Design an enzyme around this catalytic site. Structure first.
Site, PDB file in Angstrom:
ATOM      1  N   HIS B  18       0.983  -1.225   0.255  1.00  0.00           N
ATOM      2  CA  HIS B  18       0.061  -0.002   0.126  1.00  0.00           C
ATOM      3  C   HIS B  18       1.038   1.603  -0.360  1.00  0.00           C
ATOM      4  CE1 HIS B  18      -2.899  -2.649   2.169  1.00  0.00           C
ATOM      5  NE2 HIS B  18      -3.559  -2.997   0.775  1.00  0.00           N
ATOM      6  N   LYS B  42     -16.974  -7.618   5.519  1.00  0.00           N
ATOM      7  CA  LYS B  42     -16.571  -8.544   6.357  1.00  0.00           C
ATOM      8  C   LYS B  42     -15.649  -8.049   7.868  1.00  0.00           C
ATOM      9  CE  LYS B  42     -11.653 -10.081   6.804  1.00  0.00           C
ATOM     10  NZ  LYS B  42     -11.499 -11.626   7.754  1.00  0.00           N
ATOM     11  N   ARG B  91      -3.240  -6.444  -8.465  1.00  0.00           N
ATOM     12  CA  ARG B  91      -2.436  -7.221  -7.691  1.00  0.00           C
ATOM     13  C   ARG B  91      -2.855  -8.053  -9.371  1.00  0.00           C
ATOM     14  NH1 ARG B  91      -1.725 -11.744  -6.025  1.00  0.00           N
ATOM     15  NH2 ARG B  91      -3.759 -11.696  -4.893  1.00  0.00           N
ATOM     16  N   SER B 129      -3.046  -7.443   2.946  1.00  0.00           N
ATOM     17  CA  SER B 129      -3.601  -7.712   4.133  1.00  0.00           C
ATOM     18  C   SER B 129      -3.979  -8.798   4.876  1.00  0.00           C
ATOM     19  CB  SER B 129      -4.490  -6.608   4.388  1.00  0.00           C
ATOM     20  OG  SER B 129      -4.285  -5.168   4.328  1.00  0.00           O
TER      21      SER B 129
END
Lengths: 176, 159
Positions: B18, B42, B91, B129
């Site tokens: 990030h 979530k 990504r 993450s």
């Protein structure tokens, strides 16, 4: 800070916004509304943009370099901060020669994503100070390519919606 | 003239990947806001307050970057913040399809917002993450992937 030239010339990273000069390379044989959309969007976010037209592509183009440069120049005349140029090297070498720090790449399909990621890694190896930036096409232009427009036009299909007038005229002329 | 970019995500927590994206973005745009989603789908490991605090410290060294929480339509936040650019990191292929869908929707919602895509450095191409947390939860070394402030906070959460 102010008169700090006596102390430092300055670094590119960590220190706020820098002058941006972008290259948008391709064959542009010929330029379509999709290309014009990409470069228009790029010219609104970066200081200067060069449309870089490949001189000697792998497959022989329908339009020669001179024709391609001329058609694109007219089509993009309304953008004050855009210049059209031919080139005959690696996009990385042209960018170095032109002191450009941004490479614009259009991202149309999932199939192309892998290849684009590979090229970006190679370009980072060749020219670490060149940043690759990726723009998705408008929904309107998502299915068009130079190649598809030519093949449709070769069999008299209507492609007036996909090209600027100057380019449409030139294309009709090429096909009899 | 002036460009102002939003970089939205959950950042639960912010990683070196990030930081690389936002560093590159801050070098090409006048201002960048790291926009941290308040109420993700979530339930996150760190709450909004924790996420904003960790990111603020990690990005303190970038003069033209601000960290903020948000809890509304990305189009409304961007309009409120007078931002004209939306930054997304890209990504994997699976993420590209979803991002292209959201970009079409955002063009509908806010025609004057331009979406821009950056690819991660080779160094950070496999980290997320989610992966860093799962590795750390089973005592794997993740020191290479996080800034010190974030690494410390994460170890603390797992004790």
């Amino acid at each position: 800070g102010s008169h700090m030239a006596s102390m430092t010339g300055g670094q590119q990273m960590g220190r706020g916004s820098m002058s941006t000069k972008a290259i948008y390379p391709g064959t542009f044989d010929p330029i379509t509304n999709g290309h014009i959309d990409i470069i228009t969007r790029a010219a609104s976010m970066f200081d200067r943009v060069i449309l870089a037209i490949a001189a000697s592509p792998s497959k022989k183009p329908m339009f020669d370099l001179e024709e391609r440069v001329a058609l694109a120049t007219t089509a993009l005349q309304h953008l004050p901060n855009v210049e059209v140029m031919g080139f005959s090297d690696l996009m990385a070498n042209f960018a170095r020669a032109q002191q450009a720090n941004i490479l614009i790449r259009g991202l149309r399909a999932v199939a192309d994503f892998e290849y684009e990621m590979q090229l970006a890694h190679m370009n980072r190896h060749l020219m670490p100070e060149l940043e690759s930036v990726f723009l998705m096409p408008s929904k309107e232009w998502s299915f068009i390519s130079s190649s598809l427009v030519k093949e449709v036009a070769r069999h008299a299909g209507d492609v007036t919606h996909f090209l600027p007038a100057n380019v449409h005229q030139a294309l009709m002329e090429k096909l009899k």
